[PDB]
Design a binder for this molecule. Structure first.
Ligand SMILES: CCCCCCCC/C=C\CCCCCCCC(=O)OC[C@H](O)CO
Ligand SMILES: *C/C=C(C)/C=C/C=C(C)/C=C/C1=C(C)CCCC1(C)C
Ligand SMILES: *C/C=C(C)/C=C/C=C(C)/C=C/C1=C(C)CCCC1(C)C
Ligand SMILES: *C/C=C(C)/C=C/C=C(C)/C=C/C1=C(C)CCCC1(C)C
Ligand SMILES: *C/C=C(C)/C=C/C=C(C)/C=C/C1=C(C)CCCC1(C)C
Ligand SMILES: *C/C=C(C)/C=C/C=C(C)/C=C/C1=C(C)CCCC1(C)C
Ligand SMILES: CCCCCCCCCCCCCCCCCCCC
Ligand SMILES: CCCCCCCCCCCCCCCCCCCC
Ligand SMILES: CCCCCCCCCCCCCCCCCCCC
Ligand SMILES: CCCCCCCCCCCCCCCCCCCC
Ligand SMILES: CCCCCCCCCCCCCCCCCCCC
Ligand SMILES: CCCCCCCCCCCCCCCCCCCC
Ligand SMILES: CCCCCCCCCCCCCCCCCCCC
Ligand SMILES: CCCCCCCCCCCCCCCCCCCC
Ligand SMILES: CCCCCCCCCCCCCCCCCCCC
Ligand SMILES: CCCCCCCCCCCCCCCCCCCC
Ligand code: NA
Ligand code: NA
Ligand code: NA
Ligand code: NA
Ligand code: NA
Lengths: 274, 275, 274, 274, 273
């Protein structure tokens, strides 16, 4: 009786994980939080070369990095504590004492981080006809709701497929909403900045779009092949890779590109340019 | 025989916690201390854009963040160490070896932090009819007493409902006193600063009022449906720990940010705070 | 229970056990201890810019103390929690041999590094009149070391051998009064030739120095201050560890703050502190 | 036990066991590893003020690498110690299943982050002549990724399947030479247009780059470089882990230092480095 | 069968450690790494007050402090992990699970740190007759070899007294060489700086000499009294105190004195006075 548990635990409690599956997941999750703390240094070290008006972008990035490090660290330790090598069969199996594995650390990370990442672009670019205050509140409300609904759903990703998908769908509503507003902001952002600045905002959009889509991909990962191929250790590896790739892109790379824009806009483009 | 223990331990020792209840509490408590360390960075990184006379506000915020991180971290680890998964029934139960769970880490955090948060506003605003030193001492005395009395009470929140509520009440006395003085401060603060600065102080009050009220809510959370119903159970534990987390974040970080923003605007450097 | 040359906490823990309140409180207060130290560090780092160059070593030495103190007081807190385990049957915490015996030695060795600095550091802020920098320092340093080293030896015996306990205690006290004597000299010579604002602070410093430093020998004797009386119990343990914590905070952080404030005023940057 | 697709360390540890010297040394050297990384970080942070704006991203990227490397090399060190337990009966360290299997994957995934940055970062110090920044970078980035990813896969098989081991190894080596080729191009074009002092450093960088990068494939093959021969033993383990450590220190820290020194000289702040 | 293990483990495996012996060793080793991280703050905080050309001294100190913290921390945890209280007899005994105790963390710390400490003086002072490049390489080569040989020897300090002392001796060769060169450096350093600067370099030498000598003292500590007085828990305490005192002196105090010299040599001597 595992109960309302993530699917990792069900694989780990039956099939077990192979060396490669466990170690890789372990490694990738470690890379996750490593990249976050590393990134922090980039934002701290470049802040002197951002003008005052843009500086909060760098600061908010830095804030995200710290939050993310700590929670993604917790997530990594959740993985390793939760599954123990069985000497007899040569596979890793669920260890009750280390607690059940749960992706909740990541999700709660999103709860802090999502509002900031959406907010923080608004310090770099300027809107035309839209109201800063409105855009922010929309971001913040939709963002919260997207994560909170998703957070509830994923508890059920095995126990109750319907609640899984209901909450998932509702989340997607809130998800799809955010995409709309962000496109609005990038477009109004593009108005009034050099072609150089424009090109960056274009890259940002593609990054934002791809990277944010990854998340619901990883939500569904176990099932994207119906007891098929990804309902296995392969699925676990796949989920945790994608989450890691997503989080790195959506925070660090995202933050870097914003920072680069803010730096160029400050006529300190020499720092970012080679 | 648990004794003078928090009610979490009694739930954990009888009902057990469901996966969702345990994991959520675990997650939210982690979010708690994560946000504190994160916040620290905000205060450090904005300090250059506060004028010298306001800068102690920023510094005191930073101080709080560090204290809070460390003690809230301790609090999170208290939770996780104290309750272990039972594979047979699929619920988390009290682990004696990991020590009893207690909210005391949080409370003693308050003991350091409350004085600073009350103190620190006084470096941004200027009073009219009150003396800096008087307001501070009131804050500091009442603040200490509020926490110390509350701290004693919560040990009894199961063992002895009377002492629970006595100490609770006494605490509440000092609580209202602080509210009273703070309202005085924010009003005198509002006198003589631009409308922009005024509006922030207004938000600060609302935040201060709502967020500080949460705490006694969370104190009583187990019993807010008396002797039964949703709140004397794992649901109550989740509820308490969410509210504490929300409270602590609001009362320290958000509070500190709003003060910081005020101090930054007052320094004629509003450009990084608003854009 | 063949405990040997052990602190009295272990003897209580090994017989009576600690109640929930006693254990948790001690645990909490010891945590507060090291938390306050690291917090304080931030104050000293962040204020250094506002003290003039010639006083700045006071701030630096404070910062140094804070770090040392954090690490050792952290170790001390972990010593407490490791050393006593909840007994499910009776609902009290009892000595756990595996987690090592509890010992206040971490704290004492902290004193060994910290005491010389705290005595030294005032000399950067004040100017002596009649007394010789070199003499005052060496006296502080010699007496300071000896006070701690003798105390450190004594406390091992606070149960095993009451005589050595009190002998070493007394010897320590000799050096204690010496330090008090010299420090009073310093504060008074310090007061000669500095602004009234500076004077007032040095007055406060002395009161704080005096009260806070007296606490220590109080806590040394705490188990016995009521002869098998009231404080030879879990109550005594709580009492000792509260007092040590209060002492250490006052004698380092508050002390350091007051010195900092003095150094800041003497630099004509008093707008920060008011 | 039944180990599967595991590193060879585990097979030694599961049969021969490790001697005190072998275990302790490996333990010590791996600790040195991550210690040096965090230490290095301090150098890059502290010297950045003395590099001109246009070079500064070199120092920043170094700093980023240091942090990533600390965290992952720390993980790697703890992987070693957790995985092998002293057996009091024989006086040798043996594989502990509970501490999880040892795997070098932490290191490899560290490479995945770090390799692109180290190759990238030189381009902020020097200017190319005949080559296109964009092309050189993409080659570095693509080949770098592929080199590590292929290597990462191979090393899982270094015992289980020697053919896959060597295939993947070889494929990796393809991309390796490519990177070497491009880097030589870069260092030469880099040398064009800077003082002889700067030139001399770029020369040293190349020899360091060349030697240090070569070490890695040496360490890949280390168990077999003597066929059930001399290095298929605890000696081989020691040898591998020393070489990896030496490589990583050289290829990141020393490499980074030399680049930093170049950037400092180019900024006419050569007095710092002299 | 402990094998090629440090002597601490043999005491811990037979005699056991008394409360005082264990706790003291535990405490002192903790003080060790605590002082390192503390020191770091001093070097970071004073850096602004040393001129550009001396600044690498402060930086190299800072680097050492961090390395030292981490490895001395590891060393402290090695001690506590390795010996467990026995409730029946009231003594601490060797715990296999916590791994055998070994001073190797410290030694490998030396491997990183020795080159820097020898190097770093050269950023503050200027040589007269001797060649920067040569002095450094001598320091670096001899320094490495001194540690590597010592590191090998100490594994044998119980198992094989001959290898212990051979490797020890070889190490000592390189040791004196470093002492020789350093004296050369301090003297050439003294040429062309004020008497104030001179006096500091004099203190540095005394400190350098005393503190560095301590190390081989601690190497031999178990035997310095032949089944004698120091082949006991007393010897363990003695070794670990001396190592701690040595490391603090040879890095932190050393670094401070150099920093003070660098600060003095710059306009702003007021900070250190
Ligand atoms: C410090 C003050 C302690 C007061 C304890 C208390 O109020 O409770 C008494 C009653 O015995 C609770 O069971
Ligand atoms: C730094 C973290 C970020 C940017 C997280 C973003 C998370 C999402 C976009 C999540 C989206 C989800 C859905 C659209 C459906 C399933 C539930 C979620 C929350 C994973
Ligand atoms: C950062 C922490 C803060 C601002 C803590 C505030 C705590 C309170 C306002 C506590 C109030 C209480 C009562 C009014 C009654 C019950 C006992 C307390 C202490 C929880
Ligand atoms: C930061 C730590 C400080 C300022 C420690 C001060 C410690 C003392 C003044 C200790 C005094 C003692 C006696 C006077 C008798 C008993 C032994 C001592 C060392 C506790
Ligand atoms: C900081 C880490 C660096 C610079 C890592 C470099 C790694 C390599 C050059 C690895 C090369 C390999 C081969 C050429 C064959 C075997 C597989 C590899 C990846 C170890
Ligand atoms: C910061 C660490 C330092 C300065 C270490 C210095 C170490 C030595 C001078 C060691 C000397 C030794 C001998 C001369 C003989 C025995 C082996 C050694 C390495 C301990
Ligand atoms: C042009 C600016 C380049 C700066 C790159 C810094 C990025 C650091 C984040 C960590 C790297 C993760 C890549 C997988
Ligand atoms: C191990 C994690 C280290 C990250 C914190 C280091 C950031 C401090 C450097 C800031 C210095 C600013 C110089 C401009
Ligand atoms: C949830 C709260 C997360 C912590 C917030 C810390 C930094 C927030 C800064 C916001 C900037 C406001 C200026 C407008
Ligand atoms: C691990 C979290 C560290 C955050 C605090 C470090 C901030 C230092 C940056 C100061 C630069 C201005
Ligand atoms: C309430 C317990 C105190 C511990 C907090 C330590 C943090 C430093 C306090 C700074 C106070 C600054 C006030 C100076 C103005 C006079
Ligand atoms: C783990 C928490 C570490 C926080 C300690 C504080 C470190 C000081 C950095 C502040 C830099 C201020 C620069 C202005
Ligand atoms: C808990 C670890 C504390 C180590 C100190 C880290 C260095 C802090 C940097 C302070 C910079 C302040 C300069 C103004
Ligand atoms: C110019 C000299 C630079 C000093 C190098 C400091 C980098 C620290 C890394 C330690 C390397 C181990 C030997
Ligand atoms: C274990 C702690 C080591 C991390 C080093 C953090 C770097 C802090 C440097 C602060 C720079 C201040 C600039 C003057
Ligand atoms: C007990 C040793 C601990 C070392 C901590 C850092 C030492 C700072 C010393 C400051 C004195 C320098 C100026 C006085 C001459
Ligand atoms: Na595991
Ligand atoms: Na748990
Ligand atoms: Na305990
Ligand atoms: Na081990
Ligand atoms: Na132990």
């Amino acid at each position: 009786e595992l109960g309302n548990a993530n699917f990792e635990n069900f694989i780990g409690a039956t099939e077990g994980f192979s060396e490669i599956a466990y170690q890789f997941t372990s490694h990738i999750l470690t890379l996750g939080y490593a990249v976050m703390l590393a990134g922090l240094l980039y934002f701290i070290l470049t802040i002197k070369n951002v003008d005052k008006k843009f500086q909060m972008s760098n600061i908010l990035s830095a804030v995200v990095m710290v939050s993310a490090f700590l929670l993604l660290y917790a997530q990594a330790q959740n993985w390793t504590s939760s599954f123990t090598f069985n000497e007899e069969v040569g596979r890793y199996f669920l260890d009750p004492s280390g607690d059940l594995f749960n992706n909740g650390y990541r999700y709660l990370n999103w709860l802090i981080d999502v509002p900031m990442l959406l907010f923080q672009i608004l310090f770099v670019v300027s809107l035309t006809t839209s109201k800063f205050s409105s855009v922010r509140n929309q971001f913040w409300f939709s963002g919260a709701m997207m994560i909170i609904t998703g957070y509830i759903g994923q508890f059920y990703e095995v126990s109750n497929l319907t609640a899984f998908l209901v909450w998932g769908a509702i989340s997607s509503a809130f998800f799809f909403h955010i995409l709309w507003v962000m496109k609005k902001v990038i477009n109004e952002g593009k108005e009034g900045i050099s072609p150089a600045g424009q090109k960056i905002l274009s890259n940002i959009w593609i990054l934002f779009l791809i990277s944010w889509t990854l998340y619901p991909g990883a939500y569904l990962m176990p099932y994207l092949t119906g007891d098929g191929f990804l309902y296995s250790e392969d699925g676990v590896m796949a989920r945790q890779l994608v989450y890691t790739i997503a989080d790195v892109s959506s925070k660090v790379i995202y933050g870097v590109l914003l920072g680069n824009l803010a730096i160029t806009l400050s006529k300190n483009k020499e720092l970012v340019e080679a």
